[PDB]
């Protein structure tokens, strides 16, 4: 088993009030079964689009989730991951710069 | 030097639960997907059939369709024969294709996330360090002359031929230029560079003309629109920010580098 790495970053420069796209790139996990949610104020964003699961040269899986989002002065965004390698869901928050 | 990679991911949970899903890449662009749910291989590009005729594409698909079924039955029969020695769940990965320069082909197989088997020359072989229980199923597989002849044909002939057709047909998408957009944030200073294509790029923190050596380049992270994202960070004394800039060079820019001053 390998534990997922999670990076959360935006497609365009984040500017408060302007629609943008948030990415959650999950890598370095095995086995391939995994649950990825994107969160707005800790609540699940329903429209989340996933790439096809693929894998790298070292055989570990990766997958990209993305969703439309509008950064504001008042909203937090996160990517939450459930995977057999971890006892609890692992959540990483968009650091608001990325 | 485009590497064409066909990636199969098969998960076997128990008796009679499994799935196989595949994706195909030409360099960093996805050209096909093949979902376990789908009877047929899906195109993810207008040019994903390359220079192959409808008829030739159809045959190549049917062979893959028989293969996906044969593969699944074979692995399930093997586990059955092995019991209880090899037990579910089982994860098999295949990475097959060719890299053009002339060309070279590969078919690598991993089991439980570890590289165990390759096709090389005219036969399947286990790789050094692979579990010894694999030696006998590989020997048996090797006696299937038809499969060996087919795999040799696919690796030696079909792959490079199909891919030269993809390169021609995909030329517009493969040779596309997308411009990066950069922004700064932060002590550690971050220069965010998003939306560029192709992958080669140069991102550096400068003080005037001097490259700042401590610039830590991050990983290339993909965007969902077949462009790339990169950050470059620099740890600076909270007295130094003044005068620093992020500079980006990229083929799409035409010599007009992005310079962003802090
Ligand atoms: C090129 C366009 C892109 C589209 C590609 C999308 C999907 C691509 C996915 C994968 C690529 C695979 C390349 C292989 C091609 C095979 C060619 C073919 O047609 O063969 C047909 C054959 C058809 O085989 C069948 O018919 C035969 C008649 O000749 C025989 O009677 C066989 O017994 C019967 O199974 O498929 C097979 O041989 C079964 C596949 C088993 C090979 C896998 C070996 C894996 C090693 C196991 C190690 C793991 C640990 C074990 C766990 C316990
Ligand atoms: C496909 O190419 C491989 C070369 O990678 C060929 O394998 C060689 O075949 C000859 C004759 O069988 C052997 O003497 C060599 O030792 C093989 N090379 C290796 C590295 O094992 C293979 O014959 C080709 N097959 C077809 C059908 O064209
Ligand atoms: C077989 O596999 C699938 C997925 O793991 C599961 O739904 C099914 O219940 C399994 N059988 C068991 C656990 O007995
Ligand atoms: C994968 O597809 C095969 C072939 O149709 C089917 O039998 C199997 O149930 C599928 N697995 C899953 C999890 O859907």
- Please say whether the beta carbons of A42 and A11 come within 8 A: no
Ligand 3: does its nearest atom lie under 6 Å from the Cβ of B14? Answer: yes
Residues B148, B180 share a domain: no
CATH number at residue B191: 2.60.40.10
B191 shares a domain with B257: yes
Q: Report the C-alpha gap between B3 and B168 in whole angstroms.
A: 15
Q: Left (φ > 0), alpha (ψ -120 to 50) or beta: where does A7 sit?
A: beta
CB distance B108 to B163 below 8 Å: no
DSSP string, B41-99: PEESSTTTTTT--HHHHHHHHHHHHHHHHHHHHHHHHHHHHHTTSS-S-EEEEEEEEEE
Is residue B69 within 6 Å of ligand 3 at its C-beta?
no
B164 & B76 share domain: yes
Query: Same domain for B106 and B230?
Result: no
Cα atoms found within 13 Å of the Cα of residue B12, Cβ hemisphere only? 22
B51 & B129 share domain: yes
Alpha-carbon distance of B159 to B242, in angstroms, equals 54
Count: domains in chain B: 2
Dihedral in degrees, nearest 10, Cα atoms A88, A74, B230, B234:
-100
Is the bond into A53 cis (omega within 30 degrees of 0)? Answer: no
List the residue whose alpha carbon is closest to atom 8 of ligand 2. B121
What CATH number has the domain bearing residue B71?
3.30.500.10
One domain for residues B21 and B6: yes
Choose the final residue of a domain: B121, B144, B175: B175
Domain CATH code at residue A83: 2.60.40.10
Q: How many CB pairs lie under 8 A apart between chains A and B?
A: 73
Does B171 share its domain with B181?
A: no
How many structural domains are present in chain A?
1
CA distance B258 to A64: 27
Domain match, B233 and B158 both: no
**What resolution in Å is listed for this PDB structure?**
2.0
DSSP A30: B
Gap from B168 CA to chain A (nearest CA, Å): 25
* B185 within ligand 2 shell (Cβ under 6 A): no
Please tell me whether residues B153 and B169 are part of one structural domain.
yes
- Give bridge partners of residue B182 from the DSSP assignment: B193
Q: Both B50 and B96 in a single domain? A: yes
Q: Let me know whether B108 and B162 are in one domain.
A: yes
Q: Hey, how many other C-beta atoms are within 10 angstroms of the C-beta on A52?
A: 19
In a shared domain, residues B158 and B261: no
User: Which of B158, B175, B192 marks a domain boundary?
Assistant: B175
Domain span at B61: 1-175
Nearest CA to ligand 1 atom 15: B151
Domain termination site, one of B122, B142, B175 = B175
Across the interface, which of A9, A30, A60 has its CB nearest the CB of B229? Answer: A9
At CA B28, angle to CA B152 and CA B220, rounded to 5?
135
Which range marks the domain in which residue A6 is found? 1-98
What the block records as the tokens of B105 is: 């082909």
* Residue in chain B lying closest to A15 (CA): B183
CB contact at 8 A, B255 and B212: no
* Distance of alpha carbon B193 from alpha carbon B183, whole angstroms: 7
**Contact in structure between A71 and A13 (CB atoms under 8 Å):** no
Phi first, then psi, for residue B144 (nearest 5°) are -75, 85
Q: Which two tokens stand for residue B107?
A: 């078919």
Beta carbons of A97 and A22 less than 8 angstroms apart: no
Q: Which of B15, B114, B124, B126 is nearest to B73 (CA)?
A: B15
Instruction: Read off the DSSP letter of residue B132.
Output: G
């Amino acid at each position: 088993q390998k534990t997922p790495q999670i990076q959360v970053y935006s497609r365009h420069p984040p500017e408060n009030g302007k629609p943008n796209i948030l990415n959650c790139y999950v890598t370095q996990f095995h086995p391939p079964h995994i649950e990825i949610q994107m969160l707005k104020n800790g609540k699940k964003i329903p429209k989340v689009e996933m790439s096809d699961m693929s894998f790298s040269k070292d055989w570990s899986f990766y997958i990209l989730a993305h969703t439309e989002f509008t950064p504001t002065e008042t909203d937090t965004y996160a990517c939450r991951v459930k995977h057999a390698s971890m006892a609890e869901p692992k959540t990483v928050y968009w650091d608001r710069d990325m | 030097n485009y590497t064409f990679r066909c990636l199969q991911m098969s998960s076997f949970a128990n008796r009679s639960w499994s799935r196989t899903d595949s994706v195909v890449w030409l360099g960093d662009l996805q050209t096909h997907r093949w979902s376990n749910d789908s009877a047929t291989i899906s195109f993810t590009k207008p040019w994903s059939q390359g220079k192959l005729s409808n008829q030739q594409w159809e045959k190549l698909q049917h062979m893959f369709q028989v293969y996906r079924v044969s593969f699944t039955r074979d692995i399930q029969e093997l586990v059955k024969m092995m019991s209880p020695k090899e037990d579910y769940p089982i994860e098999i990965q295949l990475s097959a294709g060719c890299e053009m320069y002339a060309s070279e082909s590969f078919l690598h197989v991993a089991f439980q996330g570890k590289y165990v088997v390759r096709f090389w020359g005219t036969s399947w072989q286990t790789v050094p360090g692979a579990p010894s229980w694999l030696d006998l199923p590989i020997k048996v597989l090797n006696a299937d002359q038809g499969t060996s002849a087919t795999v040799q044909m696919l690796l030696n002939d079909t792959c490079p031929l199909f891919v030269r057709g993809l390169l021609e047909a995909g030329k517009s998408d493969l040779e596309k230029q997308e411009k990066p957009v950069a922004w700064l944030s932060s002590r550690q200073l971050v220069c965010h560079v998003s939306g560029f294509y192709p992958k080669p790029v140069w991102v550096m923190w400068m003080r005037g003309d001097q490259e700042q050596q401590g610039t830590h380049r991050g990983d290339f992270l993909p965007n969902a629109d077949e462009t790339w994202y990169l950050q470059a960070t620099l740890d600076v004394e909270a007295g130094e920010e003044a005068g620093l800039a992020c500079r980006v060079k990229h083929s799409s820019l035409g010599g007009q580098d992005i310079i962003l001053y802090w």
